[PDB]
Protein backbone atom coordinates (compact mmCIF):
# COMPACT_ATOMS: atom_id res chain seq x y z
CA UNK A 1 0.00 0.00 0.00
CA UNK A 2 1.02 3.59 0.60
CA UNK A 3 2.73 5.14 3.61
CA UNK A 4 2.94 8.80 4.71
CA UNK A 5 6.66 9.60 5.15
CA UNK A 6 7.09 13.11 6.40
CA UNK A 7 5.01 14.97 3.75
CA UNK A 8 4.94 12.42 0.92
CA UNK A 9 2.66 9.39 0.29
CA UNK A 10 4.97 6.67 -1.10
CA UNK A 11 4.65 2.92 -1.78
CA UNK A 12 5.31 0.89 1.39
CA UNK A 13 8.46 -0.60 -0.18
CA UNK A 14 10.02 2.86 -0.41
CA UNK A 15 10.19 3.79 3.33
CA UNK A 16 13.39 3.29 5.29
CA UNK A 17 14.00 4.23 8.93
CA UNK A 18 17.52 5.22 10.21
CA UNK A 19 19.12 3.32 13.13
CA UNK A 20 19.83 6.66 14.89
CA UNK A 21 16.26 7.88 14.57
CA UNK A 22 15.60 9.02 18.16
CA UNK A 23 12.27 7.14 18.09
CA UNK A 24 14.24 3.90 17.63
CA UNK A 25 16.91 4.75 20.31
CA UNK A 26 14.99 6.64 23.06
CA UNK A 27 11.26 6.17 22.10
CA UNK A 28 11.49 9.97 21.68
CA UNK A 29 8.26 10.74 19.90
CA UNK A 30 4.47 10.76 20.08
CA UNK A 31 1.59 9.11 18.14
CA UNK A 32 -2.11 8.77 17.45
CA UNK A 33 -4.68 6.31 16.04
CA UNK A 34 -7.76 7.51 14.06
CA UNK A 35 -10.69 5.23 13.14
CA UNK A 36 -12.20 5.36 9.60
CA UNK A 37 -15.88 4.36 9.09
CA UNK A 38 -17.02 3.78 5.49
CA UNK A 39 -14.16 5.97 4.18
CA UNK A 40 -14.62 8.85 6.66
CA UNK A 41 -12.30 9.79 9.56
CA UNK A 42 -13.89 9.99 12.96
CA UNK A 43 -12.80 12.90 15.23
CA UNK A 44 -9.68 13.56 13.12
CA UNK A 45 -9.17 17.21 14.24
CA UNK A 46 -9.33 16.21 17.91
CA UNK A 47 -6.64 13.62 17.37
CA UNK A 48 -4.43 16.09 15.40
CA UNK A 49 -4.77 18.63 18.27
CA UNK A 50 -3.69 16.02 20.82
CA UNK A 51 -0.71 14.97 18.58
CA UNK A 52 0.60 18.56 18.49
CA UNK A 53 -0.05 19.00 22.27
CA UNK A 54 1.91 15.72 23.05
CA UNK A 55 4.69 16.99 20.79
CA UNK A 56 4.84 20.42 22.58
CA UNK A 57 4.97 18.80 26.00
CA UNK A 58 8.33 17.18 25.09
CA UNK A 59 9.36 20.11 22.87
CA UNK A 60 9.16 18.67 19.36
CA UNK A 61 8.07 21.25 16.75
CA UNK A 62 6.07 19.51 14.02
CA UNK A 63 7.14 21.09 10.76
CA UNK A 64 3.64 21.28 9.11
CA UNK A 65 0.47 23.14 9.94
CA UNK A 66 -2.43 21.14 11.38
CA UNK A 67 -4.47 21.62 8.14
CA UNK A 68 -1.66 20.28 5.92
CA UNK A 69 -1.53 17.22 8.26
CA UNK A 70 -5.32 16.67 7.89
CA UNK A 71 -5.06 16.81 4.05
CA UNK A 72 -2.14 14.35 3.97
CA UNK A 73 -4.22 12.02 6.10
CA UNK A 74 -7.20 12.39 3.70
CA UNK A 75 -4.93 11.55 0.78
CA UNK A 76 -3.61 8.43 2.51
CA UNK A 77 -7.13 7.01 3.10
CA UNK A 78 -7.93 7.61 -0.62
CA UNK A 79 -4.86 6.00 -2.12
CA UNK A 80 -5.13 2.94 0.10
CA UNK A 81 -8.92 2.80 -0.55
CA UNK A 82 -9.62 2.30 3.16
CA UNK A 83 -13.22 1.55 3.97
CA UNK A 84 -13.49 0.59 7.67
CA UNK A 85 -10.24 0.40 9.70
CA UNK A 86 -7.73 2.86 11.14
CA UNK A 87 -4.84 5.18 10.43
CA UNK A 88 -1.72 4.99 12.63
CA UNK A 89 0.71 7.96 12.63
CA UNK A 90 3.69 9.06 14.76
CA UNK A 91 6.29 11.81 15.06
CA UNK A 92 9.89 11.31 16.47
CA UNK A 93 12.41 14.14 17.30
CA UNK A 94 14.46 13.14 14.17
CA UNK A 95 17.68 11.30 13.45
CA UNK A 96 20.77 12.61 15.07
CA UNK A 97 24.09 11.14 16.40
CA UNK A 98 23.14 9.41 19.67
CA UNK A 99 23.10 11.70 22.69
CA UNK A 100 20.44 12.27 25.42
CA UNK A 101 20.07 16.07 25.12
CA UNK A 102 18.21 17.55 22.20
CA UNK A 103 20.04 17.70 18.80
CA UNK A 104 22.24 20.79 18.88
CA UNK A 105 21.90 21.07 15.13
CA UNK A 106 18.13 21.56 14.44
CA UNK A 107 17.19 18.31 12.89
CA UNK A 108 13.73 17.76 11.33
CA UNK A 109 11.15 15.32 12.88
CA UNK A 110 10.35 12.06 11.06
CA UNK A 111 6.59 11.36 10.50
CA UNK A 112 5.24 7.95 9.55
CA UNK A 113 1.59 7.07 8.90
CA UNK A 114 -0.23 4.06 7.35
CA UNK A 115 -3.65 2.38 7.26
CA UNK A 116 -5.11 -1.05 8.15
CA UNK A 117 -8.52 -2.35 7.09
CA UNK A 118 -10.12 -3.58 10.32
CA UNK A 119 -13.91 -4.03 10.97
CA UNK A 120 -15.75 -2.81 14.07
CA UNK A 121 -15.45 -5.23 17.07
CA UNK A 122 -19.15 -6.16 16.96
CA UNK A 123 -19.00 -9.42 18.89
CA UNK A 124 -17.17 -7.66 21.80
CA UNK A 125 -19.46 -4.64 21.92
CA UNK A 126 -22.33 -7.07 22.01
CA UNK A 127 -21.19 -9.82 24.37
CA UNK A 128 -18.55 -7.91 26.40
CA UNK A 129 -15.01 -8.93 27.52
CA UNK A 130 -12.88 -10.23 30.44
CA UNK A 131 -10.19 -8.01 32.04
CA UNK A 132 -7.52 -8.38 34.80
CA UNK A 133 -5.93 -5.95 37.26
CA UNK A 134 -2.24 -5.07 36.82
CA UNK A 135 -0.06 -2.72 38.90
CA UNK A 136 0.82 0.50 37.15
CA UNK A 137 4.60 0.77 36.89
CA UNK A 138 4.63 3.44 34.19
CA UNK A 139 6.34 6.85 34.34
CA UNK A 140 4.66 9.90 35.83
CA UNK A 141 3.76 11.84 32.62
CA UNK A 142 1.07 9.48 31.32
CA UNK A 143 -0.71 12.57 30.01
CA UNK A 144 1.77 12.59 27.01
CA UNK A 145 0.85 9.88 24.39
CA UNK A 146 4.52 8.89 23.74
CA UNK A 147 6.34 5.92 22.19
CA UNK A 148 7.68 4.89 25.67
CA UNK A 149 5.19 2.06 25.80
CA UNK A 150 7.05 -0.78 27.54
CA UNK A 151 4.97 -0.62 30.75
CA UNK A 152 1.82 -1.04 28.60
CA UNK A 153 3.33 -3.81 26.41
CA UNK A 154 4.06 -5.98 29.53
CA UNK A 155 0.60 -5.32 31.10
CA UNK A 156 -1.29 -6.20 27.89
CA UNK A 157 0.77 -9.40 27.47
CA UNK A 158 -0.12 -10.45 31.08
CA UNK A 159 -3.79 -9.90 30.19
CA UNK A 160 -3.53 -11.89 26.93
CA UNK A 161 -1.90 -14.78 28.77
CA UNK A 162 -4.86 -14.97 31.19
CA UNK A 163 -7.29 -15.05 28.26
CA UNK A 164 -8.33 -11.39 28.90
CA UNK A 165 -8.91 -8.67 26.36
CA UNK A 166 -7.52 -5.85 28.55
CA UNK A 167 -5.40 -5.04 31.63
CA UNK A 168 -6.81 -2.42 34.07
CA UNK A 169 -3.90 -0.68 35.73
CA UNK A 170 -3.76 0.68 39.27
CA UNK A 171 -1.34 2.66 41.50
CA UNK A 172 -1.53 1.28 45.08
CA UNK A 173 -5.03 0.06 44.36
CA UNK A 174 -6.42 3.28 42.80
CA UNK A 175 -7.51 2.35 39.23
CA UNK A 176 -5.97 4.79 36.73
CA UNK A 177 -6.68 3.51 33.12
CA UNK A 178 -6.27 0.39 30.93
CA UNK A 179 -3.08 -0.55 29.07
CA UNK A 180 -4.62 1.02 25.95
CA UNK A 181 -8.01 2.37 27.04
CA UNK A 182 -9.72 4.56 29.66
CA UNK A 183 -11.80 2.78 32.32
CA UNK A 184 -15.30 3.71 33.45
CA UNK A 185 -17.46 2.25 36.20
CA UNK A 186 -21.25 2.73 36.66
CA UNK A 187 -22.88 2.62 40.15
CA UNK A 188 -26.53 3.70 40.77
CA UNK A 189 -26.82 5.52 37.46
CA UNK A 190 -23.66 7.57 38.00
CA UNK A 191 -20.63 7.42 35.69
CA UNK A 192 -17.21 7.34 37.39
CA UNK A 193 -13.76 7.76 35.88
CA UNK A 194 -10.26 8.89 36.93
CA UNK A 195 -9.64 12.64 36.52
CA UNK A 196 -7.41 13.62 33.65
CA UNK A 197 -4.11 14.58 35.36
CA UNK A 198 -0.54 13.21 34.72
CA UNK A 199 -1.61 9.71 35.90
CA UNK A 200 -3.73 9.01 32.78
CA UNK A 201 -4.13 9.73 29.07
CA UNK A 202 -7.06 12.05 28.35
CA UNK A 203 -8.78 9.81 25.78
CA UNK A 204 -10.86 11.29 23.01
CA UNK A 205 -13.37 8.36 23.19
CA UNK A 206 -13.48 9.10 27.02
CA UNK A 207 -14.49 12.67 26.34
CA UNK A 208 -17.02 11.69 23.63
CA UNK A 209 -18.60 9.29 26.14
CA UNK A 210 -18.74 11.96 28.90
CA UNK A 211 -20.55 14.18 26.35
CA UNK A 212 -22.98 11.30 25.42
CA UNK A 213 -23.66 10.85 29.16
CA UNK A 214 -24.50 14.57 29.60
CA UNK A 215 -26.84 14.10 26.60
CA UNK A 216 -28.80 11.19 28.15
CA UNK A 217 -28.69 13.12 31.42
CA UNK A 218 -26.51 10.72 33.32
CA UNK A 219 -24.32 12.28 36.14
CA UNK A 220 -20.56 12.07 35.68
CA UNK A 221 -18.12 12.23 38.59
CA UNK A 222 -14.43 12.34 37.76
CA UNK A 223 -13.18 10.91 40.99
CA UNK A 224 -10.95 7.80 41.15
CA UNK A 225 -12.15 4.46 42.39
CA UNK A 226 -10.21 1.49 43.78
CA UNK A 227 -9.81 -2.07 42.56
CA UNK A 228 -12.18 -3.04 45.40
CA UNK A 229 -14.84 -0.53 44.35
CA UNK A 230 -14.43 -1.47 40.67
CA UNK A 231 -15.51 -4.98 41.59
CA UNK A 232 -18.65 -3.64 43.38
CA UNK A 233 -19.92 -1.58 40.36
CA UNK A 234 -23.15 -2.34 38.54
CA UNK A 235 -21.47 -1.95 35.10
CA UNK A 236 -17.92 -1.51 33.79
CA UNK A 237 -16.46 -0.74 30.36
CA UNK A 238 -13.33 0.43 28.61
CA UNK A 239 -12.96 3.00 25.83
CA UNK A 240 -10.57 3.63 22.98
CA UNK A 241 -10.66 4.72 19.29
CA UNK A 242 -10.53 1.03 18.17
CA UNK A 243 -12.62 -0.68 20.82
CA UNK A 244 -15.29 2.08 21.09
CA UNK A 245 -17.39 1.25 24.22
CA UNK A 246 -16.44 -2.37 25.00
CA UNK A 247 -18.38 -3.80 27.99
CA UNK A 248 -16.22 -5.53 30.70
CA UNK A 249 -18.31 -8.37 32.15
CA UNK A 250 -15.74 -10.15 34.36
CA UNK A 251 -12.52 -9.22 36.17
CA UNK A 252 -10.19 -12.01 37.38
CA UNK A 253 -12.90 -14.66 37.58
CA UNK A 254 -15.39 -12.28 39.35
CA UNK A 255 -18.53 -11.38 37.36
CA UNK A 256 -19.46 -7.70 37.23
CA UNK A 257 -22.93 -7.97 38.71
CA UNK A 258 -24.58 -10.85 36.67
CA UNK A 259 -22.02 -11.05 33.85
CA UNK A 260 -24.27 -9.37 31.32
CA UNK A 261 -23.94 -6.00 29.54
CA UNK A 262 -25.72 -3.43 31.73
CA UNK A 263 -28.50 -1.08 30.68
CA UNK A 264 -26.60 2.23 30.97
CA UNK A 265 -23.74 0.79 28.86
CA UNK A 266 -26.32 -0.12 26.13
CA UNK A 267 -27.73 3.44 26.38
CA UNK A 268 -24.21 4.93 25.96
CA UNK A 269 -23.49 2.60 22.97
CA UNK A 270 -26.76 3.70 21.23
CA UNK A 271 -25.90 7.36 21.77
CA UNK A 272 -22.35 6.76 20.51
CA UNK A 273 -23.81 5.14 17.33
CA UNK A 274 -25.44 8.47 16.45
CA UNK A 275 -21.98 10.02 16.27
CA UNK A 276 -20.49 7.58 13.73
CA UNK A 277 -20.42 8.51 9.98
CA UNK B 1 31.65 2.40 8.48
CA UNK B 2 30.08 -0.99 9.14
CA UNK B 3 27.14 -1.94 11.31
CA UNK B 4 26.23 -5.25 12.93
CA UNK B 5 22.75 -6.16 11.55
CA UNK B 6 21.55 -9.20 13.36
CA UNK B 7 24.51 -11.64 12.73
CA UNK B 8 26.14 -9.95 9.77
CA UNK B 9 28.44 -6.91 9.63
CA UNK B 10 27.25 -4.86 6.63
CA UNK B 11 28.14 -1.40 5.26
CA UNK B 12 26.25 1.34 7.14
CA UNK B 13 24.11 2.30 4.16
CA UNK B 14 22.70 -1.26 3.71
CA UNK B 15 20.83 -1.32 7.04
CA UNK B 16 17.07 -0.88 6.78
CA UNK B 17 14.83 -0.56 9.90
CA UNK B 18 11.11 -1.45 9.42
CA UNK B 19 8.40 1.05 10.51
CA UNK B 20 6.70 -1.84 12.46
CA UNK B 21 9.89 -2.76 14.32
CA UNK B 22 8.66 -2.83 17.99
CA UNK B 23 11.74 -0.82 18.90
CA UNK B 24 10.33 2.02 16.70
CA UNK B 25 6.69 1.81 17.87
CA UNK B 26 7.05 0.83 21.60
CA UNK B 27 10.68 1.31 22.63
CA UNK B 28 10.45 -2.47 23.17
CA UNK B 29 14.11 -3.33 23.42
CA UNK B 30 17.27 -3.14 25.54
CA UNK B 31 20.75 -1.71 24.95
CA UNK B 32 24.40 -1.50 26.05
CA UNK B 33 27.41 0.86 25.62
CA UNK B 34 30.98 -0.56 26.00
CA UNK B 35 34.07 1.70 26.22
CA UNK B 36 37.03 0.73 24.00
CA UNK B 37 40.46 2.06 25.04
CA UNK B 38 43.35 1.72 22.50
CA UNK B 39 41.48 -0.99 20.55
CA UNK B 40 40.59 -2.99 23.73
CA UNK B 41 36.99 -3.50 24.98
CA UNK B 42 36.79 -2.65 28.72
CA UNK B 43 34.55 -4.98 30.90
CA UNK B 44 32.86 -6.43 27.82
CA UNK B 45 31.77 -9.69 29.55
CA UNK B 46 29.94 -7.74 32.26
CA UNK B 47 28.10 -5.63 29.62
CA UNK B 48 27.04 -8.75 27.55
CA UNK B 49 25.77 -10.43 30.69
CA UNK B 50 23.76 -7.32 31.53
CA UNK B 51 22.32 -7.25 27.97
CA UNK B 52 21.08 -10.86 28.18
CA UNK B 53 19.73 -10.15 31.68
CA UNK B 54 17.85 -7.00 30.53
CA UNK B 55 16.41 -8.98 27.57
CA UNK B 56 15.25 -11.76 29.86
CA UNK B 57 13.48 -9.37 32.26
CA UNK B 58 11.19 -8.32 29.41
CA UNK B 59 11.21 -11.82 27.81
CA UNK B 60 13.07 -11.20 24.56
CA UNK B 61 15.10 -14.33 23.69
CA UNK B 62 18.38 -13.34 22.07
CA UNK B 63 18.86 -15.94 19.25
CA UNK B 64 22.70 -16.20 19.58
CA UNK B 65 24.97 -17.48 22.27
CA UNK B 66 27.01 -15.05 24.41
CA UNK B 67 30.11 -16.41 22.66
CA UNK B 68 28.85 -15.72 19.11
CA UNK B 69 27.77 -12.26 20.43
CA UNK B 70 31.27 -11.63 21.80
CA UNK B 71 32.84 -12.57 18.43
CA UNK B 72 30.50 -10.26 16.55
CA UNK B 73 31.47 -7.29 18.81
CA UNK B 74 35.10 -8.11 18.25
CA UNK B 75 34.72 -8.14 14.46
CA UNK B 76 32.84 -4.87 14.61
CA UNK B 77 35.69 -3.14 16.48
CA UNK B 78 38.27 -4.36 13.99
CA UNK B 79 36.17 -3.75 10.80
CA UNK B 80 35.80 -0.13 11.99
CA UNK B 81 39.39 0.22 13.32
CA UNK B 82 38.18 1.84 16.51
CA UNK B 83 40.93 3.15 18.81
CA UNK B 84 39.34 4.98 21.84
CA UNK B 85 35.54 5.41 21.83
CA UNK B 86 32.58 3.13 22.30
CA UNK B 87 30.32 0.45 20.90
CA UNK B 88 26.57 0.90 21.14
CA UNK B 89 24.30 -2.16 20.59
CA UNK B 90 20.62 -2.82 21.14
CA UNK B 91 18.13 -5.67 20.67
CA UNK B 92 14.36 -5.23 19.95
CA UNK B 93 11.57 -7.82 20.01
CA UNK B 94 11.26 -7.70 16.18
CA UNK B 95 9.01 -6.62 13.33
CA UNK B 96 5.40 -7.62 13.56
CA UNK B 97 2.04 -5.90 12.67
CA UNK B 98 1.47 -3.34 15.39
CA UNK B 99 -0.12 -4.69 18.56
CA UNK B 100 0.93 -4.23 22.25
CA UNK B 101 1.05 -7.91 23.15
CA UNK B 102 3.96 -10.03 22.04
CA UNK B 103 3.76 -11.62 18.53
CA UNK B 104 1.43 -14.68 19.01
CA UNK B 105 3.38 -15.99 16.08
CA UNK B 106 7.20 -16.26 16.19
CA UNK B 107 9.23 -13.34 15.13
CA UNK B 108 13.05 -13.00 15.31
CA UNK B 109 14.61 -10.16 17.45
CA UNK B 110 16.34 -7.29 15.56
CA UNK B 111 19.98 -6.61 16.64
CA UNK B 112 21.86 -3.42 15.76
CA UNK B 113 25.43 -2.45 16.81
CA UNK B 114 27.89 0.25 15.66
CA UNK B 115 30.97 2.25 16.87
CA UNK B 116 31.93 5.87 17.60
CA UNK B 117 35.42 7.41 18.10
CA UNK B 118 35.53 9.32 21.44
CA UNK B 119 38.53 10.14 23.73
CA UNK B 120 38.48 10.18 27.53
CA UNK B 121 36.88 13.32 29.12
CA UNK B 122 40.09 14.47 30.70
CA UNK B 123 39.18 18.06 31.46
CA UNK B 124 36.11 16.90 33.39
CA UNK B 125 38.04 14.41 35.49
CA UNK B 126 40.67 17.03 36.37
CA UNK B 127 38.46 20.10 36.96
CA UNK B 128 35.11 18.58 38.01
CA UNK B 129 31.64 19.68 36.76
CA UNK B 130 28.47 21.52 37.73
CA UNK B 131 25.25 19.65 38.37
CA UNK B 132 21.58 20.37 39.02
CA UNK B 133 18.82 18.50 40.95
CA UNK B 134 15.92 17.31 38.73
CA UNK B 135 13.04 15.27 40.06
CA UNK B 136 12.84 11.69 38.93
CA UNK B 137 9.66 10.90 36.98
CA UNK B 138 10.78 7.68 35.27
CA UNK B 139 9.03 4.27 35.36
CA UNK B 140 9.53 1.87 38.27
CA UNK B 141 11.70 -0.66 36.45
CA UNK B 142 14.88 1.43 36.19
CA UNK B 143 16.93 -1.72 36.80
CA UNK B 144 16.28 -2.71 33.12
CA UNK B 145 18.54 -0.81 30.65
CA UNK B 146 15.64 -0.38 28.10
CA UNK B 147 15.03 1.92 25.15
CA UNK B 148 12.30 3.81 27.12
CA UNK B 149 14.54 6.84 27.80
CA UNK B 150 12.27 9.88 27.48
CA UNK B 151 12.37 10.85 31.25
CA UNK B 152 16.19 10.80 30.98
CA UNK B 153 16.40 12.89 27.74
CA UNK B 154 14.15 15.55 29.32
CA UNK B 155 16.26 15.62 32.56
CA UNK B 156 19.51 15.83 30.57
CA UNK B 157 18.15 18.66 28.41
CA UNK B 158 17.24 20.62 31.56
CA UNK B 159 20.72 20.16 33.02
CA UNK B 160 22.32 21.25 29.73
CA UNK B 161 20.17 24.39 29.72
CA UNK B 162 21.47 25.47 33.10
CA UNK B 163 25.07 24.98 31.89
CA UNK B 164 25.37 21.76 33.92
CA UNK B 165 26.97 18.51 32.83
CA UNK B 166 24.53 16.21 34.54
CA UNK B 167 21.13 16.12 36.13
CA UNK B 168 21.08 14.41 39.56
CA UNK B 169 17.69 12.80 39.99
CA UNK B 170 15.75 12.53 43.27
CA UNK B 171 12.52 10.76 44.17
CA UNK B 172 10.93 11.33 47.68
CA UNK B 173 13.74 13.73 48.61
CA UNK B 174 16.22 10.91 48.01
CA UNK B 175 19.04 11.09 45.44
CA UNK B 176 18.67 8.08 43.14
CA UNK B 177 21.09 8.37 40.17
CA UNK B 178 21.95 10.80 37.32
CA UNK B 179 20.11 10.78 33.95
CA UNK B 180 22.88 8.66 32.52
CA UNK B 181 25.20 7.98 35.49
CA UNK B 182 25.31 6.68 39.13
CA UNK B 183 25.96 9.23 42.02
CA UNK B 184 28.34 8.90 45.01
CA UNK B 185 28.92 11.13 48.06
CA UNK B 186 31.93 11.06 50.48
CA UNK B 187 31.67 12.14 54.12
CA UNK B 188 34.35 11.85 56.74
CA UNK B 189 36.21 9.35 54.57
CA UNK B 190 33.18 7.07 53.94
CA UNK B 191 31.78 6.34 50.48
CA UNK B 192 27.96 6.49 50.09
CA UNK B 193 25.74 5.45 47.19
CA UNK B 194 22.11 4.41 46.64
CA UNK B 195 21.43 0.60 46.76
CA UNK B 196 20.89 -1.24 43.53
CA UNK B 197 17.21 -2.03 43.44
CA UNK B 198 14.39 -1.09 40.93
CA UNK B 199 15.02 2.70 41.40
CA UNK B 200 18.44 2.76 39.71
CA UNK B 201 20.48 0.91 37.07
CA UNK B 202 23.23 -1.13 38.73
CA UNK B 203 26.05 0.54 36.77
CA UNK B 204 29.11 -1.47 35.75
CA UNK B 205 31.36 1.60 36.52
CA UNK B 206 29.52 1.80 39.94
CA UNK B 207 30.69 -1.71 40.74
CA UNK B 208 34.23 -1.01 39.44
CA UNK B 209 34.40 2.07 41.72
CA UNK B 210 33.16 0.09 44.77
CA UNK B 211 35.98 -2.41 43.99
CA UNK B 212 38.49 0.54 43.91
CA UNK B 213 37.21 1.64 47.35
CA UNK B 214 37.71 -1.88 48.75
CA UNK B 215 41.30 -2.02 47.42
CA UNK B 216 42.37 1.22 49.16
CA UNK B 217 40.39 0.38 52.34
CA UNK B 218 37.76 3.05 52.10
CA UNK B 219 34.46 2.02 53.81
CA UNK B 220 31.47 1.76 51.41
CA UNK B 221 27.90 2.27 52.74
CA UNK B 222 25.16 1.60 50.16
CA UNK B 223 22.70 3.84 51.85
CA UNK B 224 20.37 6.50 50.37
CA UNK B 225 20.99 10.16 51.11
CA UNK B 226 18.69 13.18 50.63
CA UNK B 227 19.39 16.17 48.45
CA UNK B 228 20.22 18.29 51.53
CA UNK B 229 22.71 15.66 52.72
CA UNK B 230 24.24 15.67 49.24
CA UNK B 231 24.89 19.38 49.55
CA UNK B 232 26.57 18.76 52.91
CA UNK B 233 28.95 16.05 51.65
CA UNK B 234 32.71 16.67 51.78
CA UNK B 235 32.95 15.42 48.14
CA UNK B 236 30.61 14.18 45.34
CA UNK B 237 31.02 12.47 41.94
CA UNK B 238 29.11 10.56 39.19
CA UNK B 239 30.07 7.41 37.22
CA UNK B 240 29.37 5.83 33.86
CA UNK B 241 31.09 3.92 31.04
CA UNK B 242 31.89 7.09 29.16
CA UNK B 243 32.33 9.58 32.04
CA UNK B 244 34.33 7.28 34.34
CA UNK B 245 34.66 9.20 37.70
CA UNK B 246 33.73 12.85 37.04
CA UNK B 247 33.97 15.06 40.21
CA UNK B 248 30.92 17.22 40.91
CA UNK B 249 32.06 20.48 42.51
CA UNK B 250 28.90 22.46 42.51
CA UNK B 251 25.15 21.86 42.50
CA UNK B 252 22.71 24.66 41.70
CA UNK B 253 25.10 27.41 42.61
CA UNK B 254 26.26 25.90 45.93
CA UNK B 255 29.83 24.65 46.20
CA UNK B 256 30.60 21.16 47.43
CA UNK B 257 32.83 22.03 50.38
CA UNK B 258 35.48 24.38 48.86
CA UNK B 259 34.57 23.75 45.25
CA UNK B 260 37.88 21.95 44.62
CA UNK B 261 38.18 18.21 43.73
CA UNK B 262 38.54 16.35 47.04
CA UNK B 263 41.19 14.09 48.42
CA UNK B 264 39.27 10.78 48.25
CA UNK B 265 37.84 11.39 44.79
CA UNK B 266 41.45 11.80 43.59
CA UNK B 267 42.61 8.58 45.18
CA UNK B 268 39.62 6.73 43.67
CA UNK B 269 40.50 8.11 40.17
CA UNK B 270 44.15 6.96 40.66
CA UNK B 271 42.92 3.49 41.53
CA UNK B 272 40.52 3.44 38.48
CA UNK B 273 43.43 4.38 36.22
CA UNK B 274 45.09 1.02 37.05
CA UNK B 275 42.06 -0.92 35.78
CA UNK B 276 42.10 0.73 32.36
CA UNK B 277 43.87 -0.65 29.15
C1 LIG C 1 -2.70 4.52 27.69
C2 LIG C 1 -3.99 4.93 26.95
N1 LIG C 1 -5.06 5.41 27.66
C3 LIG C 1 -6.25 5.70 27.01
C4 LIG C 1 -6.37 5.52 25.66
C5 LIG C 1 -7.68 5.90 24.94
O1 LIG C 1 -7.50 6.99 24.00
P1 LIG C 1 -8.43 7.21 22.72
O2 LIG C 1 -9.81 7.20 23.22
O3 LIG C 1 -8.00 8.69 22.36
O4 LIG C 1 -8.03 6.31 21.62
C6 LIG C 1 -5.29 5.05 24.93
C7 LIG C 1 -5.37 4.95 23.42
O5 LIG C 1 -5.54 3.80 23.03
C8 LIG C 1 -4.10 4.75 25.57
O6 LIG C 1 -3.05 4.28 24.81
C1 LIG D 1 20.22 5.63 33.91
C2 LIG D 1 21.66 5.16 33.98
N1 LIG D 1 22.22 4.90 35.21
C3 LIG D 1 23.52 4.48 35.32
C4 LIG D 1 24.30 4.33 34.21
C5 LIG D 1 25.79 4.03 34.38
O1 LIG D 1 26.03 2.67 34.06
P1 LIG D 1 27.39 2.16 33.43
O2 LIG D 1 28.42 2.30 34.48
O3 LIG D 1 27.06 0.64 33.20
O4 LIG D 1 27.63 2.77 32.12
C6 LIG D 1 23.75 4.57 32.94
C7 LIG D 1 24.63 4.31 31.67
O5 LIG D 1 24.14 4.49 30.54
C8 LIG D 1 22.41 4.99 32.83
O6 LIG D 1 21.83 5.21 31.59
Swiss-Prot record, chains A, B:
Recorded catalytic activity of this chain's protein: D-alanine + 2-oxoglutarate = D-glutamate + pyruvate
GO CC list: cytosol
GO MF annotations in UniProt: D-alanine-2-oxoglutarate aminotransferase activity; pyridoxal phosphate binding
Amino acids binding substrate: 31, 98, 100
Temperature dependence: Optimum temperature is 60 degrees Celsius.
Cofactor: pyridoxal 5'-phosphate
Location of N6-(pyridoxal phosphate)lysine modifications: 145
Domain of life of the source: Bacteria
Active-site feature positions: 145
Gene3D superfamilies registered for this protein in UniProt: 3.30.470.10, D-amino Acid Aminotransferase, subunit A, domain 2
Gene Ontology BP terms: D-amino acid biosynthetic process; D-amino acid catabolic process
InterPro entries recorded: Aminotrans_IV, Aminotrans_IV_CS, Aminotransferase-like, BCAT-like_C, BCAT-like_N, Class-IV_PLP-Dep_Aminotrnsfr, D_amino_transT
Listed EC numbers: 2.6.1.21
Disulphides: none
UniProt pH dependence: Optimum pH is 8.3.
List of residues binding pyridoxal 5'-phosphate: 50, 177
Its job: Acts on the D-isomers of alanine, leucine, aspartate, glutamate, aminobutyrate, norvaline and asparagine. The enzyme transfers an amino group from a substrate D-amino acid to the pyridoxal phosphate cofactor to form pyridoxamine and an alpha-keto acid in the first half-reaction. The second-half reaction is the reverse of the first, transferring the amino group from the pyridoxamine to a second alpha-keto acid to form the product D-amino acid via a ping-pong mechanism. This is an important process in the formation of D-alanine and D-glutamate, which are essential bacterial cell wall components.
NCBIfam families per UniProt: D_amino_aminoT
Stated family: Belongs to the class-IV pyridoxal-phosphate-dependent aminotransferase family.
Summary of subunit composition and partner proteins: Homodimer.
Protein name according to UniProt: D-alanine aminotransferase
Provenance organism: Bacillus sp. (strain YM-1)
